[PDB]
Design a protein around this ligand. Structure first.
Ligand SMILES: [Ca+2]
Ligand SMILES: [Ca+2]
Ligand SMILES: [Ca+2]
Ligand SMILES: [Ca+2]
Ligand SMILES: [Ca+2]
Ligand SMILES: [Ca+2]
Ligand SMILES: [Ca+2]
Length: 272
């Protein structure tokens, strides 16, 4: 059993998941009670996107070791990957009962609540995960986003700042820092933060368009036009950029130009 299992593991570690599977099977015919082999089998399926199979084998493992926090968690992950967040929540909770000091189970429960739209729970769970281990830029950023969804921009900012100390190349944190400053009425700081996100992701049509909107809302149509042009160079099929370009001309009293861009917007999308 064990030698076959160790063979499977060596294949797994080298990323040969199909070979790992063959050898874990061999080990399981010789010892059908090896929860370790079931779980690793499951993992080898998970690694190929075969979530139905992973789940089956994780359940076998849990039959033999119902106190495997690891199997409960990976079960939760398989359901998470399939977008069944209610199941993910159930299994992560089962994991956390067995291992209540797992930062990963707390964080992922936070993620699942976030995906369900329960930002209050996301918050409580992210917080517990960061208590246990504050080293992930991503977790601080997600915490910030949850506060953002709850309209607490002042907390959002604090946590974005924390994400950015840990990872100042996070374009996402700069961008959302920008949004939070935007909603607090600090648009020049917003623009600054959008520009920083733009330096790190200069090929994002959406980020250029966003910056154009920021300028437009300040009545700087000169700059608005320039940014929308940039967005459209990156994505000529953006009805939204075409439309807002038309709006920027509209606001400047150039109606022939507004018409041209509005017409382009409406050829791409005739609903509004
Ligand atoms: Ca395969
Ligand atoms: Ca299949
Ligand atoms: Ca299937
Ligand atoms: Ca299925
Ligand atoms: Ca155990
Ligand atoms: Ca599915
Ligand atoms: Ca210009």
């Amino acid at each position: 059993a064990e030698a076959w299992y160790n063979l499977g593991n060596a294949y797994y570690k080298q990323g040969d998941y199909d070979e790992a599977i063959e050898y874990y099977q061999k080990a399981l015919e010789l010892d059908p009670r090896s929860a370790e082999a079931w779980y690793n089998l499951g993992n080898a399926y998970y690694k190929q996107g075969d979530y139905d199979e992973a789940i089956e084998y994780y359940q076998k493992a849990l039959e033999l070791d119902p106190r495997s926090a690891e199997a409960w968690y990976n079960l939760g992950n398989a359901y998470y990957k399939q977008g069944d967040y209610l199941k993910a929540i159930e299994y992560y909770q089962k994991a956390l009962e067995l291992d209540p000091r797992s930062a990963e189970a707390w964080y992922n429960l936070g993620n699942a609540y976030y995906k369900q739209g329960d930002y209050l729970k996301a918050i409580e769970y992210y917080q517990k995960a960061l208590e246990l281990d504050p080293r992930s830029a991503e977790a601080w950023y997600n915490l910030g986003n949850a506060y953002y969804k709850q309209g607490d921009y002042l907390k959002a900012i604090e946590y974005y700042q924390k994400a950015l100390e840990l990872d100042p190349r996070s374009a996402e944190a700069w961008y959302n820092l920008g949004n939070a400053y935007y909603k607090q009425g600090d648009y020049l700081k917003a623009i600054e933060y959008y520009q920083k996100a733009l330096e790190l992701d200069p090929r994002s049509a959406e980020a250029w368009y966003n910056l154009g909107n920021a300028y437009y809302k300040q009545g700087d149509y000169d700059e608005a036009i320039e940014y929308y042009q940039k967005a459209l160079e990156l994505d000529p099929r953006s009805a939204e950029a075409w439309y807002n370009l038309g709006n920027a001309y509209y606001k400047q009293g150039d109606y022939d130009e507004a018409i041209e861009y509005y017409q382009k917007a409406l050829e791409l999308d005739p609903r509004s």
